[PDB]
Design a protein around this nucleic acid. Sequence first.
RNA 1: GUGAAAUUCUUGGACCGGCGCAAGACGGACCAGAGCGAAAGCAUUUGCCAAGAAUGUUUUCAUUAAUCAAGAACGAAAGUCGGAGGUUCGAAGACGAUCAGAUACCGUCGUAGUUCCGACCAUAAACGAUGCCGACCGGCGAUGCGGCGGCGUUAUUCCCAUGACCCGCCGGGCAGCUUCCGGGAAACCAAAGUCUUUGGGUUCCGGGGGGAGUAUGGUUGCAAAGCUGAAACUUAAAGGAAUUGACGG
Lengths: 24, 214, 135, 137, 83, 102
Amino acid sequence: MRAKWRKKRMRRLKRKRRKMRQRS
Amino acid sequence: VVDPFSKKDWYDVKAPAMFNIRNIGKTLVTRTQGTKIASDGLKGRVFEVSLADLQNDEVAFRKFKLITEDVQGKNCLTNFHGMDLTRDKMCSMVKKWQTMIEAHVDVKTTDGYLLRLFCVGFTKKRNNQIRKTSYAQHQQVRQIRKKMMEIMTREVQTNDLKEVVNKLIPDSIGKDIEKACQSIYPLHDVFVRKVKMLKKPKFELGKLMELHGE
Amino acid sequence: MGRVRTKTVKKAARVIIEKYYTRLGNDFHTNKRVCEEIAIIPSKKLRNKIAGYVTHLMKRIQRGPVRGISIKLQEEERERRDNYVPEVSALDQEIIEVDPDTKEMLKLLDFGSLSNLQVTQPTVGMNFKTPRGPV
Amino acid sequence: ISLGPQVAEGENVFGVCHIFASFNDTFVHVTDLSGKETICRVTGGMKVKADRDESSPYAAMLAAQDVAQRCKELGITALHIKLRATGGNRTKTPGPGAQSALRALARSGMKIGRIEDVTPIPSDSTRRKGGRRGRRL
Amino acid sequence: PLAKDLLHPSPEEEKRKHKKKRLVQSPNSYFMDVKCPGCYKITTVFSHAQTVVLCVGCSTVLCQPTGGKARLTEGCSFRRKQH
Amino acid sequence: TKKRRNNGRAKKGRGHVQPIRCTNCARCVPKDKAIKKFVIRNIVEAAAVRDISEASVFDAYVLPKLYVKLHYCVSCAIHSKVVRNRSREARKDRTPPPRFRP
RNA sequence: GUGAAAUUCUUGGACCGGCGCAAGACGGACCAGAGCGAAAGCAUUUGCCAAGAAUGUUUUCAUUAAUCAAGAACGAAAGUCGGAGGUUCGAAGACGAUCAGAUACCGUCGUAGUUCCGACCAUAAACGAUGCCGACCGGCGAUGCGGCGGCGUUAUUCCCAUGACCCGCCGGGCAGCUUCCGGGAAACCAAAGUCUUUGGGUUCCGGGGGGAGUAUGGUUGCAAAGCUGAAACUUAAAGGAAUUGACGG
Ligand SMILES: [Mg+2]
Ligand SMILES: [Mg+2]
Ligand SMILES: [Mg+2]
Ligand SMILES: [Mg+2]
Ligand SMILES: [Mg+2]
Ligand SMILES: [Mg+2]
Ligand SMILES: [Mg+2]
Ligand SMILES: [Mg+2]
Ligand SMILES: [Zn+2]
């Protein structure tokens, strides 16, 4: 996988995790 | 259905007395019907024509505008409206390993016309020069340009439009710029690249008629 | 087309020219006859192919040197080339074009002031370099 | 009549032929010396129906022949030439129709004056179309 | 050249060398007697003068300071001082 | 593996160079990196120089020249065969190719 | 307009040509292995404002210096907020193509943006993938600046300067060619040399590959995100440079 798009996918996952922690 | 080229009648074009050739060529326009006056139809027409076609044995890389201002009979009387260098000459002017100097000035003629003057020059490599590049330092370029501005305006604001045209037909100004600039940096292909009209003095009919007369 | 000689025929032709030069001549048929006994060649086609290139080579070497070598051909051609034997040497010039700097060097050597020598006008302009850059 | 002036036999009359020979099209446009009055304008698009040969030499030479007979019909013998490419920020060399229209006009009974390039040359244009990665092909 | 005589270099290359890169430092500049026109006295002007030196008695300027060395006006005779 | 000492561009003392657009595809290419081919073409092709000169009303006219400076990205330059791949030693030669004028 | 097309505009005068006007961008060719700047970066003319390197210096102070935790200024583009302006181009989006499909590459429009002012952000393959200061160690030809010399040609005038060239020298630069200086795994590098013959001064920083620049904590931010930053677990290779072959739309 292209490293730039792996980085972009990682940012999506981080934003999802922050959403779930804020939910709790 | 019927073609309108039958309704078009032909006229001739007449140059100012600056030149030994008087007839530029022929135009066409429709007849005068209703509010459509053919006289005002011809007025405001420019004619990009070679200087060599205007003189006898001059160069062909200059071109004049020669807009019409008065029409009488079959004669469309034109007056000087601008001069420019031909595209192939300007493109051949630009060379690598040398410096280009350009200047633009605003000069008001004693007659009244307003002229924007464009002049270009290039540095020169000596016959014995071995260095590939002939570059002029920035202050040298500035002094060349300042000299170009001052001794272009000092001869054009001092005489009317008629004297201006009859002195730029051999580009005697470019020779004067070229001669004066040698003490700072020698130049070879110096020409007045372009000149354009900005204002016109209230369209005196007598001034046009004396410009085409005595 | 297609008459190029193989290295087999060429080298064999050269070798017999090296060893047997006097025995051979300008005639093709005579050369092919001497080729019979100075060397053994199992093929008649190779025999007269070798002999054909021998006559071609010997015709060339009759008026010049080639990549083949004969010890005689070295010695008599060095005995020849004696000289053009000019009546005088080419370096005994009555007057010699000498730069003023050169005469200064000669008087530093102390061998200056020779009536044979005469000084020349130094060149002026100092423009000896070619114009740098393409043209 | 004859749709022309009363010019003498020896004296020639000069038109101006603007040849906007870009890619995919070949404009042939003969006007008068002022340029405000046109005599004839024929284009390779109006001479062919294939829509891909609109800048082709064949269509350009057909346009040149057609405009030549119209100029002779209306009484024009000589013709200045102003060749023009696409210009602007786009390409600057003329397309394939410029050369065939030039030869066809000359060979169809016409005189040639002065030829000049009038391609619009920006000092510095706006941003060109295509993006910074260009036309990926 | 491995065996260059560093201790005793000939004067021409010492003069050619930079002043600090000489074997012993020596300024390139010098003082010189300058005679302004229309006077009698002799004034000293630095060869690398930075200020406009003025002949006191005679009105005309002597040297215009430039980049490297002073610019002596025409007619100003100058003599060196002990090399 | 640094292929070229100059990294394929003539930039030594600069930090940044303003770009240009390829005249074939409009690729944004640094100006010091692009291939510049300055062509001097005849206005009229060599097959029709006769027809224009014959039809010219002037007794002696000189056909003009097109002065177009062309800027290429290296991909359009290679595709259009303006520049070719060279050997490792051949790449170090910066002299322009011969004109083969005679 | 394209490979061919199509969407789109068109007898309402499209395109083309001419004369004009307005707008907002952008400063071609000259423009270079050229200049400046700490980098980012900087190209129309003229003026003003401070600033700066180098050169010149028999001027002045006399060690005032080098690198630097903490801290601080600047910092492409994109992005955010507020206000103007919106020409072109153009994320998103729509349509037309193409394809088995085509959420694309191609074409026509087109939002945010691209432009300016202010306030944020602090990130790039921010690259020379290469710390700074200092010393030493080959040659050659150029080039930019400054200075010093000299045959000569040119500029004008009546002589010198003084400019344009020409032949050199010095110093500071951007670089280049060559070399069995030496180094290195080699590619290559006059530095990436002066290294087992190992120590000039001093910052930052790496420790097999992944997990992972992730989790968590703290801090910055309007947000996007930035800075700092693991572990469990998993794996015998991952990599670098060159060589031969094989293959290439
Ligand atoms: Mg491709
Ligand atoms: Mg950069
Ligand atoms: Mg349509
Ligand atoms: Mg930005
Ligand atoms: Mg906004
Ligand atoms: Mg658009
Ligand atoms: Mg240190
Ligand atoms: Mg590790
Ligand atoms: Zn391209």
